[PDB]
Amino acid sequence: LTKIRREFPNKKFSSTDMKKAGKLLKAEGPDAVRDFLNSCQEIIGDFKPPVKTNIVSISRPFEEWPVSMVGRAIQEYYFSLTKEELESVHPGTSSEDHKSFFNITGLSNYNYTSVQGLNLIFKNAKAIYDGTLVKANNKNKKLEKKFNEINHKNGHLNNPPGINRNIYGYQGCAAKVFVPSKHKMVSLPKEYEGYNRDPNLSLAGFRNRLEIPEGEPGHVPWFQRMDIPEGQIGHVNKIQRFNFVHGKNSGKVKFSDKTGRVKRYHHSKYKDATKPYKFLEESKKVSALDSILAIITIGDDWVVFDIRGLYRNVFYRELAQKGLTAVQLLDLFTGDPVIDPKKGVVTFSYKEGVVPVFSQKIVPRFKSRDTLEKLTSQGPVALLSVDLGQNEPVAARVCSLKNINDKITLDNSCRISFLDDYKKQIKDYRDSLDELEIKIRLEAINSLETNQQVEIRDLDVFSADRAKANTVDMFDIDPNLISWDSMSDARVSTQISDLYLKNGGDESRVYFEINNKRIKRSDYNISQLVRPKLSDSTRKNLNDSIWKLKRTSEEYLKLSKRKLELSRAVVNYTIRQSKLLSGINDIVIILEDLDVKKKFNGRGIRDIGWDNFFSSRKENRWFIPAFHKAFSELSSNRGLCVIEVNPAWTSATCPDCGFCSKENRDGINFTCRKCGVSYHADIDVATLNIARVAVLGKPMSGP
DNA sequence: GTATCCCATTACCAGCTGAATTAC
DNA sequence: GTAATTCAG
RNA sequence: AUUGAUUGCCCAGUACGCUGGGACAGCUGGUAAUGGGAUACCU
Ligand code: NI
Ligand SMILES: [Zn+2]
């Protein structure tokens, strides 16, 4: 069938058509398959984003489901076998094959005979088992090839995979809109009483938030509606306006220009504990009755879940026609959702042709010149060069590349400057990490007994003074001689060590012996040597309390997410600005190929001074890996063209002169040694050189 | 400067994420 | 009327 | 029927009644790495 497909290069075929093409080819013949492929409609995309839904109620715990018990059993049996044994035991797709499988194997199904369901289990388990062999083979083949070039110039799985607890739905258990009339055995919690929703009616029930009365859930407070005109719905009284205190920085409602998501129930906004939500029960009941419920029935077990997750996601991607119904909403997604028992969610995937995105891979460095040649052949293309750095989190420059042979110049191109808001967000993220650590430690300290508490609190406040006293004692020196407020640990400083070297100080006391060579004790090393230590029992208690609090803390996940949305927001803003500056919307993103696995994660930062040696180091990890992944994943998640070029000798070569030297870079300032022209090291030189490398076919020469 | 625990995160790479028709 | 067959790069 | 698109998740404000934004390719598994904090070595 592949040869027949190869004669349609311009037309893209969906997976359904290819699977349907095989049936036609085996049924009628090549004339039929060509005729069918001629009549196939062109697909607008092939990416299938997932949507997550909240599970409402379940008949049994997911561990007790027949599908879960058989799935875990089959997975364990497969992962306990060898390659030769698995090939002979893996069954076919027929019903008789499954029964034969359970007969030859001592393993027994738990009254689960669904052919489609067991077909998914066997197919997925073998794929996971074969994944380890593929993973090892590619690693070995790459390692052997890499070592060969440098030199010239099994049984039971060693690392068996874990059990995949996800339940994969099939056509037999396809999601249907829940009606209590047709599901008598299905129960529901108390808030889900009197549930009623006709599947075929439109879900387009839209209402204005400004009409809610002042004593009802969702009401927009008066002080947030002071800019609404008199003739509009949300206008506030003139007498009541005099009670508005200014400067409170409370939000202002967007009564006319608001676009995007509409929030209906706000019980989840009040996730604090100082004051519980006033309408918690009322909003819970109302949201329960306004839920859109779908049901998956596997055997005698059922899952009821919200498909409001589908609805919001569909309106986000602008994929719904007028008057969409629950049945149509479920038709927008494939009828094979995945159930996650641990997270308590049911995941839906879009159908292939719904989302107009063609996922693409990263263009390699040697294909940079070829890729732009095709892009410039079919109209123009906008170059987007992004440089990742520490002082500048990302520097972006947009180039309108009408012809591949055109010259790229700072006057020709435009620079996309990093916003101050994103710098503030990065600083706030780091501060939130530091405050989370401080709060966790403080709560753990407060969890201890009074004697341990007072001991720990006493140690922290006078930790620096006692250490300084120990230094001035063991090292006889004037405390005023050493500048304690300029002492540092990141840079090797020996202010105390050098002073002790005078007056015939002992070499052994000031120097530390190491296997490689003798190393002089740094000032931070001196402070840590004489730093007072807690008692063993108190230290153990504090460590146990800290670990217990951290294990159950839910803030680390929130911070990791917050970083993810921060990086993605920066990337989205950069893409939007690239579209805005150069009117053409065919953006190609040029990245520098970075090994973000290591050597790009920043260290912690410590404030200058001796007193800061005894406090926890502040978080200062760089955002380079986050921005690299967020930019690189644009190709797979959104279909954009992303190119990774060789980063060597970028920002070190003069944009005007070919001279290359390491001395050209002085940090955030670029000055060439041959010519006096000066530019910004990252914003101007780096982006321009990256764009030139992308347009050209070879990495730049150095030194 | 090195070494061992503890907590958190990640990077890389290996999977996975139907349905029309027929059978009965 | 739910469940088994049958396609794929 | 709405200016706006009903659940969920993240951030900042709040009079705690909400507003203004943000992400929307996700999951499972294994390995490795990094960051932070203690402790051990040494005069
Ligand atoms: Ni750079
Ligand atoms: Zn020059």
Numbering used by the authors: 8 to 160, 180 to 729
Original paper wording:
Recently, a new Class 2 family of CRISPR nucleases named Cas12j, also known as CasΦ, was found in the biggiephage clade of phages. In addition, the RuvC catalytic site of Cas12j1 and 2 also processes the precursor crRNA (pre-crRNA). This family of endonucleases recognise protospacers with a minimal T-rich PAM, and their small size (700–800 residues) together with the lack of a transactivation crRNA (trac-crRNA) to build the functional RNP, make Cas12j an atypical family of miniaturized RNA-guided nucleases. Cas12j proteins share low sequence identity with other CRISPR nucleases and display sequence homology only in their RuvC domain with Class2 type V members. They generate a staggered DNA double-strand break (DSB) and unleash unspecific ssDNA cleavage after activation with an ssDNA complementary to the crRNA, as other members of Class 2 type V7,8.
We reconstituted a functional Cas12j3−crRNA complex and determined the structure of the enzyme after severing a target dsDNA by cryo-EM. The predominant class yielded a map at a resolution of 2.7 Å, which was used to build the model of the Cas12j3/R-loop structure. The R-loop displays a T shape with the crRNA/DNA hybrid and the crRNA handle forming the horizontal and vertical bars, and the protein domains wrapping around the nucleic acids. The N-terminal region comprises the T-strand and NT-strand PAM interacting domains (TPID, NPID) and the RNA-handle binding domain (RBD), while the C-terminal consists of the catalytic RuvC and stop (STP) domains. The target DNA cleavage yields a triple strand R-loop with the T-strand hybridized to the crRNA, while the dissociated PAM NT-strand is directed towards the catalytic pocket. Our structure shows that PAM recognition in Cas12j3 is achieved by combining interactions in both strands by the TPID and NPID domains. An antiparallel β-sheet formed by β11 and β12 splits the Watson-Crick base coupling after the dG+17:C + 17 pair; thus, limiting the hybrid length to 17 nucleotides in agreement with cleavage experiments testing the efficiency of the spacer length. The RuvC insertion runs alongside the crRNA strand of the hybrid, making multiple contacts with its phosphate backbone from U + 9 to G + 13. Interestingly, two nucleotides, modelled as purines, were observed in the active site in complex with Ni2+ as a by-product of the phosphodiester hydrolysis. A second metal atom, modelled as Zn, is coordinated by 4 conserved cysteines, similarly to Cas12g and the dimeric Cas12f33.
